[PDB]
Amino acid sequence: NPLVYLDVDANGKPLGRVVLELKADVVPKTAENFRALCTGEKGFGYKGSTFHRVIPSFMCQAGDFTNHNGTGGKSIYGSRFPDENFTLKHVGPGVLSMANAGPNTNGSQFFICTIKTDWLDGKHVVFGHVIEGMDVVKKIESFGSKSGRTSKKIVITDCGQLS
Ligand SMILES: NCCOCCNC(=O)[C@@H]1CCNC(=O)/C=C/C(=O)N2CCC[C@](Cc3ccccc3)(C2)C(=O)N[C@@H](Cc2ccc(-c3ccc(C#CC(=O)O)cc3)cc2)C(=O)NCc2ccccc2CC(=O)N1
Numbered sequence: 001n002p003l004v005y006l007d008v009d010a011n012g013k014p015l016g017r018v019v020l021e022l023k024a025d026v027v028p029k030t031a032e033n034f035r036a037l038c039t040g041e042k043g044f045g046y047k048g049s050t051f052h053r054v055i056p057s058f059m060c061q062a063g064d065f066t067n068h069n070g071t072g073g074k075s076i077y078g079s080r081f082p083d084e085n086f087t088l089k090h091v092g093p094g095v096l097s098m099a100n101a102g103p104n105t106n107g108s109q110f111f112i113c114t115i116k117t118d119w120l121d122g123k124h125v126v127f128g129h130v131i132e133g134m135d136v137v138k139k140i141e142s143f144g145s146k147s148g149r150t151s152k153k154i155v156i157t158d159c160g161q162l163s
Contacts, residue, residue: 001024001025001031002031005018016133016139019132023088032076034110034128049068050155059111061099063110064108080104090121092116094129096110
């Protein structure tokens with residue numbers, strides 16, 4: 001399974017590195033989309049974009065590198081792509097899952113859970129997990145709010161593939 005990283009800052013101050021294992025063994029098309037958007041190998045991707053919606057005791061959401069507000073994004077497949085499967089469940093903090101706007105509307109937006117979000121099972125495609133840097137995710141969460149608006153600008157300063 002691929003390992004990728006997000007290096008995250010808040011108002012320019014580094015928070016540290018999140019390492020994510022992508023479950024290509026279960027959701028290969030979804031994992032590949034995220035992997036490629038982390039490396040930037042297609043000329044676009046997550047580098048420089050933000051965590052735009054962060055809600056404590058829920059999740060941290062990112063990946064809208066076109067509109068920076070939860071309305072945008074773009075997949076590597078030329079169109080919104082189908083839900084690959086709903087095998088993996090939102091079991092707890094650190095789960096990596098695809099944001100969407102309903103069935104078969106996967107693009108680039110994603111979220112990292114900070115709690116078991118079981119009510120999203122069967123609605124959002126889970127495709128990875130945090131293996132290092134859950135404390136960084138908790139710091140991101142620390143800058144969220146009930147509305148999800150962040151109290152600092154949370155930026156993916158760098159991202160890429162490790163293995
Ligand atoms: N137990 C029930 C109570 O539980 C309490 C906890 N709260 C929850 O469980 C809440 C309760 C319900 N409130 C919300 O849904 C929050 C919504 C929200 O904030 N909007 C702010 C951002 C825009 C909106 C509406 C919208 C506007 C324009 C276009 C689409 C939607 C709304 C929104 O919906 N944008 C989505 C994220 C999204 C993701 C992908 C695309 C997309 C995909 C592909 C391409 C391409 C291509 C190509 O060409 O390749 C382009 C774009 C567009 C939008 C959103 O954010 N989805 C919400 C979400 C996200 C992640 C995880 C979970 C949830 C559910 C949740 O948050 N659920």
